[PDB]
Amino acid sequence: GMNINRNKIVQLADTDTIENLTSALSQRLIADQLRLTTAESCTGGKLASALCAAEDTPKFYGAGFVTFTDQAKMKILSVSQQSLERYSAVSEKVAAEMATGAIERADADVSIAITGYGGPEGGEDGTPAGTVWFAWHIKGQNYTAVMHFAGDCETVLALAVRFALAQLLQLLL
Amino acid sequence: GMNINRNKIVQLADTDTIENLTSALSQRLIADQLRLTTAESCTGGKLASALCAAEDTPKFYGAGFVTFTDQAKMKILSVSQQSLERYSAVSEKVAAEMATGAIERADADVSIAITGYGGPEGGEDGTPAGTVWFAWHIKGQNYTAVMHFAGDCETVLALAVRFALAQLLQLLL
Ligand SMILES: [Cl-]
Numbered sequence: 001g002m003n004i005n006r007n008k009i010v011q012l013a014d015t016d017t018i019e020n021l022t023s024a025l026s027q028r029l030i031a032d033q034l035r036l037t038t039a040e041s042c043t044g045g046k047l048a049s050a051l052c053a054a055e056d057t058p059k060f061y062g063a064g065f066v067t068f069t070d071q072a073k074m075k076i077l078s079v080s081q082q083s084l085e086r087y088s089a090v091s092e093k094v095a096a097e098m099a100t101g102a103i104e105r106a107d108a109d110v111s112i113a114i115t116g117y118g119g120p121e122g123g124e125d126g127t128p129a130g131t132v133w134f135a136w137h138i139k140g141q142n143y144t145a146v147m148h149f150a151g152d153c154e155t156v157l158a159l160a161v162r163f164a165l166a167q168l169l170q171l172l173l
Numbered sequence: 174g175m176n177i178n179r180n181k182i183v184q185l186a187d188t189d190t191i192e193n194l195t196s197a198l199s200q201r202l203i204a205d206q207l208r209l210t211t212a213e214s215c216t217g218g219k220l221a222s223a224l225c226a227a228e229d230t231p232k233f234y235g236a237g238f239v240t241f242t243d244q245a246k247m248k249i250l251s252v253s254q255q256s257l258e259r260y261s262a263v264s265e266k267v268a269a270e271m272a273t274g275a276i277e278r279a280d281a282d283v284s285i286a287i288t289g290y291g292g293p294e295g296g297e298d299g300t301p302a303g304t305v306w307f308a309w310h311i312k313g314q315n316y317t318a319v320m321h322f323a324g325d326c327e328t329v330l331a332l333a334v335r336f337a338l339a340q341l342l343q344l345l346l
Contacts, residue, residue, distance in 0.1 A: 062242035066236065
């Protein structure tokens, strides 16, 4: 029996700054004695940077992976070649595998994965620019969400980082 | 004999901006058919993000590591615990092992590693804030240098990223 009270796509508010989100997230994971790891592609390391700028980072976060290419996803995060060929790197399946691959490599408890098209170009399969797939691993369970962000590449990547954090907060309720 | 010209330590200039250095590095690495990987700590993923912002990132860069803790440095990049106990995480020996460890995990040709004190705190062994150790791996050979940047943490981190990139370029000439 699946309870769906927490399945809300968070709507980012101006109060959901990187600073405020990592404030809430850091103290929550420290309180829960949980260790976070991250895997990202299009955001390039900016999610990791958000967490490394948080307070008391070493008490909950150590390992961040940036895997910009198909080969890096396959080698570092054990994303399967078959899944990339079937679905492309910007896909629900690959995001989920990046989240479980980071868990494995880092020996962590919680993870966040981001893979998307920052823009101006979209996918060869027609996936429009601004589409970003996300995945989170929490308590042995995996979650995914897709978003379609408006604006240029700088604006899309900044929203993806904030969304990745804010939605983990939602899933931790 | 070792030639000082070819192995000189660079000095940052105002024209050495991130876009100009990554553009110069991208052309040079693609021309040489070499693959780059990075390992960073205090810079938090800003080095990787600078490389993922450059043009044709997939042709020369795939895998970036953020290892913010001792546990991450040991688990992800095979930094030895004894080197951490002996020299601390902000040291020449740990920087060098982060560079070689990244080469191995990524199966890359070239690597940069950064570990340091962005500030305001230094090391509790007297190592002042602003000290950053660097390592570069090229063609089997490892190079190191320590830097003492002035300014606040944001200023120190941006200087480190520029110097890491600038020095890689000169070693590649
Ligand atoms: Cl913000």
